[PDB]
């Protein structure tokens, strides 16, 4: 029959309970969170370390000792994977460190593995496993063979 | 339809220890408002020195050890500016200064220097 239309229940989250975890305002967004027993605007869900969005990538955060941390900074306070691929060595948490490509380096450990001079803003490079070669030892290599 | 990115330093010069400067860097061609921003200083022989980082919301701020006290990072969003205020300075502090954009998750610079890095301002504080 085209007469027949559909009567649905809706059981909505009441409006009462839409205070954010983050700003203890009202949530009137479309869009919005939830996590750890509480709703979230979108920009007040962060990590409590960086401060980062904290689901945006694998819908999921890392809560340990009362502190809402996104992956890499759960693994640089707990876990034992997070170590630098120059030196082999624990990436201290609240320390800046520099990824080429996949690979994560101390700053001071961010140099040439040849002539292991520390490179410079728009410096030429190739990386070979985790040795970052610059281009001017690239150069003086091909320059014997051509 | 890829805009390509800038980042354009300003502000820096000569000036005596004790003195101040305020630097800015004006951002354009990726979304400067969900990125965490950084000021990383460099001079010659030596490698590149984080000063300040800055999360998206300005919710999380860092500073090197060296800077504590002296140094303060900000930025405005809806003009795309990044900002640091300069104060006490002394000869320790002289550098090129590059606004660098920080990837999204848990303190990393990284070395696309096209995409990432300004072309620096430099900042010198006398003998």
């Known amino acids: 029959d085209p007469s027949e239309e559909p009567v649905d229940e809706v059981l909505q989250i009441p409006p009462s309970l839409l205070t954010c975890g983050g700003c203890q305002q009202n949530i009137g967004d479309r869009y919005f969170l939830k996590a750890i027993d509480q709703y979230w605007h979108e920009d007040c869900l962060s990590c409590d370390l960086c401060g980062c969005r904290l689901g945006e990538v694998g819908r999921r955060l890392y809560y340990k000792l009362g502190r809402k941390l996104c992956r890499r900074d759960y693994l640089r306070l707990f876990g034992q994977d997070g170590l630098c691929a120059s030196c082999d060595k624990r990436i201290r948490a609240y320390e800046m460190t520099m990824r080429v490509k996949d690979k994560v380096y101390h700053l001071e450990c961010f140099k040439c593995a040849a002539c292991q001079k520390h490179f410079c803003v728009g410096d030429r490079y190739l990386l070979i496993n985790s040795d970052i070669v610059c281009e001017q030892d690239i150069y003086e290599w091909t320059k014997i063979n051509g | 339809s890829m805009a390509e990115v800038q980042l354009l330093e300003s502000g820096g010069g000569l000036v005596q220890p004790g003195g101040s400067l305020r630097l800015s860097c004006a951002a354009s061609?990726?979304?400067?408002?969900?990125?965490?921003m950084n000021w990383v200083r460099q001079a010659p022989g030596k490698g590149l020195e984080w000063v300040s980082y800055?999360?998206?919301?300005?919710?999380?701020?860092y500073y090197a050890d060296s800077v504590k006290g002296r140094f303060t990072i900000s930025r405005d969003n809806s003009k795309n500016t990044l900002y640091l205020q300069m104060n006490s300075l002394r000869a320790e502090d002289t550098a090129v200064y590059y606004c660098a954009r920080g990837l999204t998750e848990s303190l990393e610079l990284t070395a696309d220097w096209f995409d990432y890095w300004g072309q620096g301002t430099l900042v010198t504080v006398s003998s």
């Open positions: 800055i999360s998206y919301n300005s919710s999380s701020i």
């Open positions: 061609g990726f979304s400067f408002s969900h990125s965490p």
